[PDB]
Amino acid sequence: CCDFCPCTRSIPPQCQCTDVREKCHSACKSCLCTRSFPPQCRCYDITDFCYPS
């Protein structure tokens, strides 16, 4: 899953998910979280695809 996905406009594209979530996160490898309850987490992985919303 991903709602907000910006991509560079090259071939291949370089894409990341800038969704802020609470869960963090199996599919994702690089995931930063704020240190609150609940946490606010982001996946800062860059990939080919998006994913879908």
């Binding site: 802020v20 690089s30 930063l32 979280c33 704020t34 240190r35 609150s36 309850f37 606010q40 800062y44």
Partner: protein
């Protein structure tokens, strides 16, 4: 706090707990009417709890004061956590004694290598979840900007700094957000973010409070 020690009751008298039914973040008392926290700790219906040690037990030195207003930084960036700083006004002035005391704002920024005190009621484990009830403390140094950026490539703005230990084992953790990083008796930092807790090469990232002294001063002056 992962890797820390039990502070002792009221030994960190500027440490406040932020409550909305449960402890969700910390903050730091900077005068009798104002608390400094993280902007990502923003919530409606906040009660500031001062004088606290065990946060599940009223031990007789607490003061519970509702927030009347919250002021998130005008440039607080939700996506990047730049300008992770918030002001909270107390609806009634706190009574200041040996156990409920304000903490001084910096006149100058702190340098790499300076030892600081980090405190909070957050998780004590870097794998799994145990929440302390008593306040925990951690002595940890400011890391060079260089060291911070290499740990977190492309994520560190000028309004951040890393503190802690690259080896791992000693860090702040979830529940610690908004709380103090104090060095040489000045509030130099605010617990902000990290990747996991106390992980190797993943130090804690903190708001660089010295960049905010003039917005704090003017904001409180007119609110």
């Amino acid at each position: 706090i992962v890797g820390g020690y039990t502070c002792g009751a009221n030994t960190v008298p500027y440490q406040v707990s932020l409550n909305s039914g449960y402890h969700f973040c910390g903050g730091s008392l900077i005068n009798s009417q104002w608390v400094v926290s993280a902007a990502h700790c923003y919530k409606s219906g906040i009660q500031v709890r001062l004088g606290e040690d065990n946060i599940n037990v009223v031990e007789g030195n607490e003061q519970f004061i509702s927030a009347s207003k919250s002021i998130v930084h005008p440039s607080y960036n939700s996506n990047t956590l730049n300008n992770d700083i918030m002001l909270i006004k107390l609806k009634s002035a706190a009574s200041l004694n040996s156990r409920v005391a304000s903490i001084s704002l910096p006149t100058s920024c702190a340098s790499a290598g300076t030892q600081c005190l980090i405190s909070g009621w957050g998780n004590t484990k870097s794998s799994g979840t145990s929440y302390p009830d008593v306040l925990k403390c951690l002595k940890a140094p400011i890391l060079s900007d260089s060291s911070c950026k290499s740990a977190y490539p492309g994520q560190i703005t000028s309004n951040m700094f890393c503190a802690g230990y690259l080896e791992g084992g000693k860090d702040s953790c979830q529940g610690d957000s908004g709380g103090p990083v104090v060095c040489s008796g000045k509030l130099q930092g605010i617990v902000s973010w990290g990747s996991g807790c106390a992980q190797k090469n993943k130090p804690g990232v903190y708001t660089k409070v010295c960049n905010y002294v003039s917005w704090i001063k003017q904001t409180i002056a007119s609110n």
